[PDB]
Amino acid sequence: MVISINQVRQLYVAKALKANTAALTTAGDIVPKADTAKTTLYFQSMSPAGIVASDKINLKHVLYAKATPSEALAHKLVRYSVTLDADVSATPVAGQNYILRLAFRQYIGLSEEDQYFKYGEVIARSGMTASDFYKKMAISLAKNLENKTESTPLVNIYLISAAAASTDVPVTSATKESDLTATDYNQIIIEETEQPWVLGMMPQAFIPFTPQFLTITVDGEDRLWGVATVVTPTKTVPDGHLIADLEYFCMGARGDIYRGMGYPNIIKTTYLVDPGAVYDVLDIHYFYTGSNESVQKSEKTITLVAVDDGSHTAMNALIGAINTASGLTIATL
Amino acid sequence: MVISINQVRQLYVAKALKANTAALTTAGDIVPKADTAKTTLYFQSMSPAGIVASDKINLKHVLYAKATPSEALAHKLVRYSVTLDADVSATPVAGQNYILRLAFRQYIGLSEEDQYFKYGEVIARSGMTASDFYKKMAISLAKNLENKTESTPLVNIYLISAAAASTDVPVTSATKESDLTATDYNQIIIEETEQPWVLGMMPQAFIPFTPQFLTITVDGEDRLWGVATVVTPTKTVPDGHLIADLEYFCMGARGDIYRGMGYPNIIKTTYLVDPGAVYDVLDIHYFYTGSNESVQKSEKTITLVAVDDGSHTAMNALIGAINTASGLTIATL
Amino acid sequence: MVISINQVRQLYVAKALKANTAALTTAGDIVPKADTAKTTLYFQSMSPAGIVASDKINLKHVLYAKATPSEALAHKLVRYSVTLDADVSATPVAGQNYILRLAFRQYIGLSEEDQYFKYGEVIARSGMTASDFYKKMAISLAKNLENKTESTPLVNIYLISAAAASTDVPVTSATKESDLTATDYNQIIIEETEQPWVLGMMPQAFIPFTPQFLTITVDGEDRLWGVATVVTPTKTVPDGHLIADLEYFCMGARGDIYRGMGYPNIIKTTYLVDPGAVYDVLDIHYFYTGSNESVQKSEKTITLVAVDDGSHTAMNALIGAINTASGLTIATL
Amino acid sequence: AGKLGKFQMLGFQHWKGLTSDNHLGAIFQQAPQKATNLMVQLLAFYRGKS
Amino acid sequence: LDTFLNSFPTREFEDDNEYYWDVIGSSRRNIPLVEARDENGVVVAANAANVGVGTSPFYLVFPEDWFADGEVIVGNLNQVYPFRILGDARMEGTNAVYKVELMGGNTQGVPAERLQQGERFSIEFAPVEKELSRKVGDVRFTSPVSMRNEWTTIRIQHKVAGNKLNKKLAMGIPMVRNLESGKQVKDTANMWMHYVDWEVELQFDEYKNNAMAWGTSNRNLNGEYMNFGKSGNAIKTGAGIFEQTEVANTMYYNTFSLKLLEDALYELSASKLAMDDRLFVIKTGERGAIQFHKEVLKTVSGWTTFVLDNNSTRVVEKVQSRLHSNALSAGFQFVEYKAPNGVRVRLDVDPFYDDPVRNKILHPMGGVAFSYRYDIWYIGTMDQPNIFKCKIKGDNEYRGYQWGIRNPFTGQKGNPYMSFDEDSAVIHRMATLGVCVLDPTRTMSLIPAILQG
Amino acid sequence: VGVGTSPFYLVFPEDWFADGEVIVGNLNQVYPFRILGDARMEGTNAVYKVELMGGNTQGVPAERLQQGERFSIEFAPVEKELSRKVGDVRFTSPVSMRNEW
Amino acid sequence: GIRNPFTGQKGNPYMSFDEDSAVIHRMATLGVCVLDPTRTMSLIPAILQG
């Protein structure tokens, strides 16, 4: 990814927290270093190549220092619950094409003027219950969206048997009617998908979508056959792929900007972010001011990352150290 | 690293051995699959992008299948034991400059005409012993070889004390005589060094040398002051770097050769070996002969690199699997 | 002693501490004044010509306010120790000229390109022990260096005995081998001297030296006989001769910058600091910031010198006053 | 057979016998040609100058 | 130092972007031996009997398949123990084993010591029959390498109050103008900016130079700079001549000798120099020149076979005095050596190696060690400057004043665009520069060990 | 002293060095100190805060930082992105001598 | 400060700050007048805002 900088941003990974400069042996170790006077602050980090230290923070020129949790940075996957509106009819209406249109705004491009429409069709028959209809519709949706041919993942279709309103019975183009032996299906959930990601070339994006229904003649009048309502998401996309591209960008500030450019004549940067983990973050904003005419500020950002075990143990001890060292009182998330 | 091929070579990492094609969940996993008639053999490996099957080995066109340990690939570092030739004098001469000349070949260039000489000088005094002389020689050698401004780690200097002829103590440009207290030193060892390695760019190479002594005047006659006896190597260079350069090359036959040529517009191959692990190898050589006129042999080989744990487990199991599947009788490590 | 200024430096002497503006009778007397709200701070010093007040210190624009004791401004006279290196020989070798060479680095011209070499020589005899060499070498050095012929005091030659090992017996050009009756002398220490000082005309400076040696022959080998090693000093040049020029310079801001140029037609300035006493110092650095667009700082210093004989009583009382008046927390020394 | 510079990334490479396009891609002799007479401009109805 | 940096040329660039160049090398090779094995595959120890005591076959292990079938290869004893390959290499991992038998008339075999690790091998030819012969042999290929370099930036500034515009000086004591040599000089100029200008230009050229020469890098092997500026960006400090050159062909001696020096120079010359281009001019101080004299003298002292004659040497000479009719003058210096096989050793003493300001480590033998330091900056010819100063074409240096109501520097009394409310001015000046050493192996440098830490 | 590009304080008897300057002791260009933060007066002794600027990771020995060490001025380096003011210039004055009858 | 990319000026006698940077500022005013709104009818859905 590329981000907007307030004149600079540095990133440092905190894999292990040590208590001395001598204990820095492994490439992810880190120490918050400050003096008893509480006048400056810096971090001693262990790099693939030797120890390094961050720019020194004047503890009187700190603008804000807040630790975000990992939950805050996980993109929630918006999901709808699609049904048929009991005002038109609580059951399918035979001979009518129950079409369903799914619009996609940020398709391959990145604008809202780059749209993409995929469809799902079901023609109803007499004796067709609602469960049978939802089954057939989810199946026709998968075959058109979750196929082995579409260049990109678009949606995750599911089914919910009212006997178990929690479990989201999944569906894919391989799934067949017989694999769905329930009779109390009551909705077609449609959830956005994690798009593919490659470090430093494909930012973590999503394709948002709205389900648009179509008309059916029920008693002589063209009427919409369903109602799409958003429900509280239940699947979140972690920040591993996000911190990783952050590093990729913020490590070209300390180091090389010619990443892989002239392939054999390059500086290969070694990165410590695992894109399969879950990091908390600790961003600290500060500035430097000069002497007696260079009073203009130079705001400079520094952020730290640390894996999350679920209880934020790594970052909590991290800042507890920074607070014992710098007098600050950052809050232990 | 470019190598010689018998018209093709392939490599597949056995990071875990399964028993079915249904257990290939994680990447690196592999199984050997052979008919019950034992007419063909192939391997189902789990690629990061999914699953694969190696070419099929017709068990009656098998040339040789041998397993290689890791000790046989760990380059053994040449040592040179250096002493005073008791023929000229068992002790130093109190006014002679004892110069040592380490001639190096295959310095930066590729050839033997790429010569390079580093020295070590010790002017000896009256009350000097052999211990003191060896100490000062090591300091002179380190300050010229084990320094922090030489582009290359040429050698590794050591000292041995007759009290512990098994323990070798290092000597760097920072070492000082006060750190060397023992009064019984009998030789100076001079090893090679693991040179810098770069996947696909800088193959594992070395720079050998000969300690060539200079003459001293002992009784009005030019005579050499020492002897350079080779001893049994003690340190090794593990094979992790060799296997990774082999994988980097052998994944350009069944894959992308434009590894980075045109940087943003590439295909990033995901290599599976850890250059910091020691692998134990298995190379099966075989060929393909066609029909009536097409009798010429297309010879082939494929390599399987599993991990070692001191004992040669993770290959004796792999070997047992291939042996029961194909009937071949391969020797265990 | 022209010093560098952060836009200005002012100095106010404190010969007595008072509680009110009505107690300022004798010159040098000073009192700190600050409103009960602790928004401004200023000093009322009794000048020789009447009461006067310092600039105003915006107490929320204080950058640093720190004190300094007398013992942290007294230049420690550095001193080597000259001996016979027991490797060459622990006794003088008969017939050899022991020519010591003291090289002087910053002689007249205020630079390192301004070098000056004084010498000292001794010819050794058979029964000459090390004690006899040390004294005879000392007398030789004293004659050459302790010259009142010399335009400058360069060095002080002293001797030490294994009996005392701390008491340094001095060796002036007046002394003679009969005055130095000890048989156990170990070394020849050489202090650097205080040079002559004149406020406004001759700033406090020093001439640094290193006792090089020349080569004697021992076994057909040219070899240095001595080893000069710095020793922990014992004597210091007190502060008075330095504060005196500090205020001689920091008074021309408050007053007359022509500190005598047309001699009869001048404003003679009366300076309260005694250049023969010791003083602790107290610097308060602050700035003046303006209104809407005039934020460009103007940094300022307020130096304060209070005689501190023995315990730092005066400056400690002064600090308690400023901290009680301004609510600051300056550290007492 | 060592590193002369500090960021020297390449090393003197050598092989014997029959080569492959892999040998040539491992010594940086194979590169993909960029089709310059080809350019996909994604299609949309651009309602921005309206 | 200025003359030193002017000894080198400049190459104008067009950017401040890292540049890299191609490094060509050498081809001819010897392949080290890994191991040898008996006919039974057993390993060959060093205290072992001969191997091919008839024309028995044995196995040679190598770290690469460099040798073809039917080729004869030889070891360290060439032409005495030939080795004919009996097939193609049965690779064991990356190691290549070969089946081999002894050619020639060898019928006692090869001793084990001639088959141990590290032994060097090579190709000789492929011998074949003249009837019913089948294919043999192969060929080989290699590839080059490259290197990098980068740049540096420097700033300076000096602030002065506005009243210094046309301020006259009384000249109580003569007013002085620091020079580059370090020599104070008496100047008549009564204005204060005359001198401010001089010192600013002076200190800036001193800035530029100390960088071009003593530039030291702050970069890491992971590619990271580690000294962060005031903005928070990284300070991208390059490396200087001495840092760039002292990575190759540098010795740190505690004791200097003509044996040490002449061996170094000759071994290097036999390897790299033709017999007609072994004239090595050495730069150093005058304390090293004396040390060269002392060493050349004792060597010539041991030349007992010849009797050195004051007639030819004129060591002692006759001068015209009044204290005597035959007055004598004694004194000589050895300023050059001439070793065997075309090696000439001359000296070129520069005072740069004697500067007592820059060099603060003193040799225990009377002087600053940097004078006891011998350097050969150009070992041979190159058709190119190996060392040059890099200059961006246009973006070389900048000048800027941010002042208030009057500018003392330019002497402008009113300001249409004021920067602040203050009777003051401050000059800002910037410059960009770089230095390049293509081949550090073409710079020999002897250095005292006291001069490293 | 100076492990991990850590800072520390050089005390001096004079304010001769500007902030943003590299100063070198006796072992020149082996241990470069970057003056960061203008000098703080400790009386007439100037105290600087420094940072090692030669990739140093092990620091500087306590023996290279004892009384008497000579310190020269190398240059003032800056980044190419948003660089603020560094450096300064210095002056000196002569003396005289006198004789009688 | 000391150089301006927008114009290409490499040094100014009238510098604004010490930092090596540059900033551009633009400012304009504007206005629209409807004399009579009653001559403009708009039939709007109640979802945009009621």
Residue numbers in the entry:
A (entry chain g), B (entry chain h), C (entry chain i): 1 to 333
D (entry chain F): 2 to 51
E (entry chain H): 52 to 504
F (entry chain I): 102 to 202
G (entry chain F): 455 to 504
Article, verbatim:
Virus ΦcrAss001 (Kehishuvirus primarius) was the first representative of this order to be isolated in pure culture from human faecal samples. Here, we present the characterization of ΦcrAss001 using cryo-electron microscopy (cryo-EM), enabling de novo structure building and elucidation of functions for around 1,440 protein subunits constituting the virion, leading to the identification of a novel ‘crass fold’ in the distal part of the tail. The virion possesses a short non-contractile tail extending approximately 44 nm from an icosahedral capsid. The extended tail barrel formed by widely conserved paralogous ring proteins has a high capacity for storage of cargo proteins alongside the capsid cargo zone, ensuring that the proteins required for the initial stages of crassvirus infection are carried inside virions and delivered to the host cell.
The icosahedral reconstruction of the capsid, which was determined to a resolution of 3.01 Å, has an outer diameter of approximately 88 nm. The capsid has a triangulation number (T) of nine, with an asymmetric unit comprising nine copies of the major capsid protein (MCP) gp32, nine copies of the capsid auxiliary protein gp36, one copy of the trimeric head fibre protein (HFT) gp21, and two copies of the dimeric head fibre protein (HFD) gp29. The MCP adopts the HK97-like fold—the canonical fold of the capsid proteins of the viruses in the class Caudovirecetes14, with the main body comprising the A-domain and P-domain. A β-barrel insertion in the E-loop, composed of residues 79–180 (I-domain), is a widespread feature of the crassviruses. This insertion domain forms a three-fold symmetric assembly with the auxiliary protein at the capsid surface, making up much of the exposed surface of the capsid and contributing substantially to the capsid wall thickness and stability. The FD domain of the auxiliary protein interacts with the A-domain of the MCP, around the periphery of each hexamer and pentamer. Each hexamer can adopt one of two conformations: winged or planar. Winged hexons span the edges of the icosahedron, on both sides of the icosahedral two-fold symmetry axes, whereas planar hexons are positioned at the three-fold symmetry axes. At the centre of each hexon is a pocket formed by the MCP and auxiliary protein, which serves as a binding site for fibre proteins. A trimer of the head fibre protein gp21 (residues 1–38) binds in the planar hexon pocket at the three-fold symmetric site, whereas a dimer of the capsid fibre protein gp29 (residues 1–58) binds in the winged hexon.
